Amino acid sequence: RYDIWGPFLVVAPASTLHNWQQEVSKFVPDFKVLPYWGTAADRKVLRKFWDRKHTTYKKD
DNA sequence: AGTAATCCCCTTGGCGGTTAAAACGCGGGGGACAGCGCGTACGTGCGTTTAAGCGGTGCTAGAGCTTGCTACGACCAATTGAGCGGCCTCGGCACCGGGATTCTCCA
């Protein structure tokens, strides 16, 4: 309706996170998921995608 | 306010391989070590003299202690920017290869 396309946060208990990852992919096939969990080194590699410079995200 | 589950993180342990470093064998060389001769250089004893050590006298510098206060640092609250943690990148240093120069050793 408004092309906001994020950033959206989703904060869950740890047993549930793969359920979100999968059900999000099911309930929208074309909508893009960042799975921010793992060891500190793994999170550092994931954090590269947190763009601060746009407060509203493009579909790209 | 307590005690236990949950979850991060970071250390220890194991498995595989690969290859670079440790172990093993062997000839020979030359350095360790015992042996010899000499000779000069250090320990000994004596006579010499030199001044260190002691008992004693004299002075004043300055170590040590008290008094008095005010200049300087301890303490607190409000302000802010210098310095730290996190992210980025590109250029310095390593690593390789190949031909050029050096050094070593037997002739």
Instruction: Kindly tell me the sign of the dihedral angle through the C-alpha atoms of A21, A52, A48, A13.
Output: negative
Task: Indicate yes or no: strand B within 7 A of the C-beta of A47.
Answer: yes
Instruction: Kindly tell me the sign of the dihedral angle through the C-alpha atoms of A33, A35, A36, A40.
Output: negative
Resolution (A): 2.7
A10, A20 Cβ separation under 8 angstroms: yes
Task: Indicate yes or no: strand B within 7 A of the C-beta of A13.
Answer: yes
A37, A43 Cβ separation under 8 angstroms: yes
Place of tokens 């309930």: A27
User: How many CB atoms sit inside 10 A of residue A21's CB?
Assistant: 15
CA/C1' separation A24–B14 (Å): 39
Kindly list the distances between the CA atom of residue A5 and the CA atoms of A13, A32, A40, in Å, as whole numbers in the listed order. Answer: 24, 9, 27
Show which positions of strand B are touched by protein (CB under 7 A).
6-10, 87-88
CA/C1' separation A12–B62 (Å): 83
